[PDB]
Amino acid sequence: GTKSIALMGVLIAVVVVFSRFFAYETTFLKISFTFIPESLIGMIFGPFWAGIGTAVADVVGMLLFPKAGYFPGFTLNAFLAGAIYGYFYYKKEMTWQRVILATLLVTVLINIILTPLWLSLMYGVNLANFAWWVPRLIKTVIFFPIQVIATYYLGNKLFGKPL
Amino acid sequence: FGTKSIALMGVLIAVVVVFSRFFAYETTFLKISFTFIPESLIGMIFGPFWAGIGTAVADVVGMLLFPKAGYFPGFTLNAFLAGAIYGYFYYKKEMTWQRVILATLLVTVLINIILTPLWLSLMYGVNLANFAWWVPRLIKTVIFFPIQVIATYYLGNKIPLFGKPLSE
Ligand SMILES: Nc1nc(=O)c2nc(CNc3ccc(C(=O)N[C@@H](CCC(=O)O)C(=O)O)cc3)cnc2[nH]1
Ligand SMILES: Nc1nc(=O)c2nc(CNc3ccc(C(=O)N[C@@H](CCC(=O)O)C(=O)O)cc3)cnc2[nH]1
């Protein structure tokens, strides 16, 4: 489907933009707004194609802007986001309950279980430092509210040609 | 030098004990107290230092009564810190979003995550970190922190103050 493809291209483009220019990016933390386009992309296109949508959005991301370095497991992250967004959100009506438990399953399962894993995995980390976790946990706990408010709102301002 | 501070405080300590022992969720290694509401009132009423001692003793009568689960000091070290934090942010200064958040944040990080699991380390003996030994904890801290910024903020902006503020 073309129409779907145009949409996808633009959306992949926006995800790239968020991660691209307006994130807080430092060596062991990024603060971006890369959750918003991806949940719209989860809503329109559903789990598998939101998954692929965002995974390739990441790889386009690093092919363009590589200085950060490429680590495989981060693109798995992208994919999971898509699937999760899509699976919770495509396409039941947004419910505080479920903007909430999507958003939880994303924060606990990709942000504190896995991203610390990747860096640990191929950056040399003394995981043992649990003063390593303090910015990560300040953040992990501050932005969940932001994320939930924003997602709810976006969720509740026909989607397009998705599937 | 307190004639009524003692009586009313006794009453608040009692509220704390009930909220703590009678009314809230628990299992080994984790809990949701809803004692932040009365312990934050004491931040608001008593300034930091007494609120700290206030809830420290609220803990210890808490355990004079309600013996099983033993007594462990560093938990009452938590209790004094909670009191003192709510005391420092909420007494004599307006409670706004910008500061309910930074109190609830310092209690949460410094006590619920830096310190409490560190006492659970010594008593029950599981020192090591486990993905996901922690996790029910982290689930609880990240789901519930908004509940406290939305409950103590509203504690700070009320429902039917009437008589006299910030002295009583
Ligand atoms: N494939 C790949 N894509 C990337 O964009 C990438 N970027 C970096 C640059 N370094 C970083 C910096 C921060 C975080 C990080 O803390 N990520 C949080 C996201 C928080 C948010 O978006 O709000 C995470 O949990 O993943 C990861 C890698 C390194 N390898 C990569 N590898
Ligand atoms: N001194 C003392 N005070 C207590 O309140 C106490 N309570 C118990 C009962 N067992 C438990 C069970 C759970 C938690 C607990 O995890 N408390 C945490 C909840 C988690 C969090 O920090 O978010 C807390 O908030 O205090 C403490 C004691 C045993 N010894 C004590 N000893």
Numbering used by the authors:
A (entry chain A): 7 to 163, 169 to 174
B (entry chain B): 6 to 165, 169 to 176
From the primary publication:
Harnessing the energy of ATP hydrolysis, ECF transporters are responsible for micronutrient uptake from the environment. ECF transporters are composed of four subunits, two cytoplasmic ATPases EcfA and EcfA', and two transmembrane proteins namely EcfS for substrate recognition and EcfT for energy coupling. The most striking divergence, setting ECF transporters apart from the canonical ABC importers, lies in the substrate-binding proteins; the former utilize integral membrane proteins (EcfSs) for substrate binding, while the latter employ periplasmic solute-binding proteins to capture substrate. Here we report the structure of the EcfS protein of a folate ECF transporter from Enterococcus faecalis-EfFolT in complex with its substrate folate.
There are six EfFolT molecules in one asymmetric unit. The overall structure of EfFolT is similar to the reported structures of EcfS proteins (RMSD of 1.5–3.3 Å) which consist of six transmembrane helices (SM1-6, transmembrane helices 1–6 of EcfS) that form a helix bundle. A pocket with the depth of 24 Å and volume of 1,230 Å3 is formed by the six transmembrane helices near the periplasmic side and is covered by the L1 loop from top. The folate molecule adopts an ‘L'-shaped conformation, with the pterin moiety forming the short arm and the aminobenzoate and glutamate moieties forming the long arm. The recognition of folate is mainly through the pterin and glutamate moieties by a number of residues protruding from SM1, L1 loop and SM3-6. Specifically, the pterin ring of folate forms π–π interactions with the parallel side chain of Phe80. The pterin N2 atom forms two hydrogen bonds with the side chains of Asp64 and Thr81, the N3 atom forms a hydrogen bond with the carboxyl oxygen of Asp64, and O4 atom forms two hydrogen bonds with the guanidine group of Arg26. Specifically, the O1 and O2 atoms of glutamate group form four hydrogen bonds with the side chains of residues Asn117, Thr121 and Arg142; and the OE1 and OE2 atoms form two hydrogen bonds with the side chains of Lys36 and Lys145. In EfFolT, the L1 loop covers on the substrate-binding pocket and adopts a ‘closed' conformation, while in LbFolT, the same loop flips away from the pocket and adopts an ‘open' conformation. In the folate-released or free state, the L1 loop adopts an ‘open' conformation to leave the pocket widely open as represented by the LbFolT structure; once folate binds into the pocket, residue Arg26 from the C terminal of SM1, and residue Lys36 from the L1 loop form three hydrogen bonds with folate, which we propose pulls the L1 loop from the ‘open' to the ‘closed' conformation as represented by the EfFolT structure.
